[PDB]
């Protein structure tokens, strides 16, 4: 159960020059490529070890597709201005995301392709990979253009074969790290309040980001009074999370913390 996803953004700056194009690529929870139009020598750069040895031919082609799409977005932003009768003095944003989804067997499960203008849905490829869904009457202009251009056929061709093949290749060249889970490093800290107390479950250094933290008391899933923070990146490819609870002093040893994660053979249980 793996995936490959791309995220592209174009932002126009009237008077400051031409739009700013950035694009990144992911395999599961691992960034592996990047492109920034504002760089001194704009080119695609590896950000994972397993695409570092693909050869100059491979990387030159990626660079030339990024530059072509940054140019394509430059026109799209101008088209969207006219559709919506917008003036030329404002900054507007264009976003795009697409990718694969594989199952356990390694064959396709579902594909993605959608766009957004100024933070709202614009057009999206349907799950059938042959029809479109337009968000408003402006997007219906773009729809019948792509219908007249046989474009949905070309997008289905990428997701159904090209996108499936290369995620498989990436998954094998980097199975040492992409298919090897990193268990979390857990520990509990006590933090006093006043004559009650707080118990914190920590979890650091794990990958992927899917994890579950639950506090308990005498075996009963106690959740109402459980503080919980958003999963955050550590900065080296791993993630963090913690769960807190408040407890009458002296009762601290009755509370256990349970962790479920892919890298663990069986769920964990911790005590202060």
């Amino acid at each position: 159960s793996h995936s490959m996803r791309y995220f592209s953004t174009s932002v126009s700056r009237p008077g400051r020059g031409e739009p700013h194009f950035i694009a990144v690529g992911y395999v599961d929870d691992t960034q592996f490529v990047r492109f920034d139009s504002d760089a001194a020598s704009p080119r695609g750069e590896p950000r994972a070890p397993w695409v570092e040895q693909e050869g100059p031919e491979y990387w030159d082609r990626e660079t030339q597709k990024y530059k072509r799409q940054a140019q394509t977005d430059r026109v799209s932003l101008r088209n969207l201005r006219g559709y919506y009768n917008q003036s030329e003095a404002g900054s507007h944003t264009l976003q795009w995301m697409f990718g694969c989804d594989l199952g356990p067997d390694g064959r396709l499960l579902r594909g993605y392709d959608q766009s957004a203008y100024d933070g709202k849905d614009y057009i999206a490829l349907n799950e059938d990979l042959r029809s479109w869904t337009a968000a408003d009457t402006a997007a219906q202009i773009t729809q019948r253009k792509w219908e007249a251009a046989r474009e949905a056929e070309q997008r289905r061709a990428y997701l159904e074969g090209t996108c499936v093949e290369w995620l498989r290749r990436y998954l094998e060249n980097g199975k040492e790290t992409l298919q090897r889970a990193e268990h979390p490093k857990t520990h509990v800290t006590h933090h006093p309040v006043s004559e009650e107390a707080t118990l914190r479950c920590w979890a650091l250094g794990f990958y992927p980001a899917e994890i579950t933290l639950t506090w308990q008391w005498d075996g009963e899933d106690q959740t109402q009074d459980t503080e919980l923070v958003e999963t955050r990146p550590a900065g080296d490819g791993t993630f963090q999370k913690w769960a807190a609870v408040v407890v009458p002093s002296g009762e601290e040893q009755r509370y256990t913390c349970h962790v479920q994660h892919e890298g663990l053979p069986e769920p964990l249980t911790l005590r202060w």
Binding site: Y66, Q69, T72, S76, S115, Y122, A149, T162
Partner: peptide
């Protein structure tokens, strides 16, 4: 692999 498509 990256893909590039038509304009809006």
């Amino acid at each position: 692999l990256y893909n590039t498509v038509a304009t809006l």
